[PDB]
Amino acid sequence: LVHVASVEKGRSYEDFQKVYNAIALKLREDDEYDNYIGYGPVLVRLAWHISGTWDKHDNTGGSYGGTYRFKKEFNDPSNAGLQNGFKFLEPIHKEFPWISSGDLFSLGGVTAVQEMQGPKIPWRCGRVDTPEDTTPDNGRLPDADKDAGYVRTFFQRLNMNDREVVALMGAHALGKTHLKNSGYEGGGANNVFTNEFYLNLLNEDWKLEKNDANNEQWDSKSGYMMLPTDYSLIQDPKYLSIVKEYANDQDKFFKDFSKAFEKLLENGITFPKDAPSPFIFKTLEEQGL
């Protein structure tokens, strides 16, 4: 099963920078969402969940086909809450109807990371919407109540290795869990992309508690939380070494996350040899906008 990137007809860097800018300006304007977190975190989670359905064995799922727009995927319990992200992106799509759905969802995540002061994430266009019958079944995204061996095995399906897994999970610096969506509860409100997930893992005094949904999670006296899968990154000695590396080197973390996130967003896509190079979008700040 081959998915060949096909550039939206006649479009170039400038076109996609306009789309980036519209998302970024909306991110800035819609500041009240989720107790003043704004939409950045949910857009990162959306880009992950539309990509994380991928299966390397048969090239099903993945970001290419934009299949989250179909009911089966939109209504995956693992995607609860992501409708907010979809609704945020709706006016962007109305304005730029030429961008594919996979391109828009993935670009939303790139734009969110960058606008939250994260690393630059090179991004490629050319995802093409595919029909409803190409929508992957529910159940391909990961459970949060498991251990390091689960995480490791899970991510092999997405062709990610230990360093790529630990880097990607640093996105849990962002936003929060919501009991109604996932059965986990959080009290953070962070919308700045940093390596603090790792620092918090290493520095807090974690206690294994049950939340109001009767699920276990790790909580600190200072009010932080970790999912069991987050905490597994310090229980496993291979993950732990990498957590320490990123806690001690912000730039290395940024560079590794950028690589891994781009790869996650591009899994399953064949880029023809004469495709455009990846685009690196300027932030609103860099443009003086």
Ligand code: HEM
């Ligand atoms: C073992 C893998 C992972 C598990 C089990 C997991 C689990 C979760 C859960 C349970 C939530 C809360 C959903 C809600 O209650 O609203 C969440 C949110 C989030 N996840 Fe993950 N996650 C994983 C990996 C990733 C990756 C790879 C990324 C992106 C690189 C990511 C980005 C996010 C972000 C940004 C949020 C916050 C959304 C918000 O504030 O609305 N996660 N994740």
Ligand SMILES: Nc1nc(N)c2ccccc2n1
């Ligand atoms: N601050 C914070 N901490 C986590 N462990 C987390 C996990 C999943 C999603 C968002 C998160 N936000």
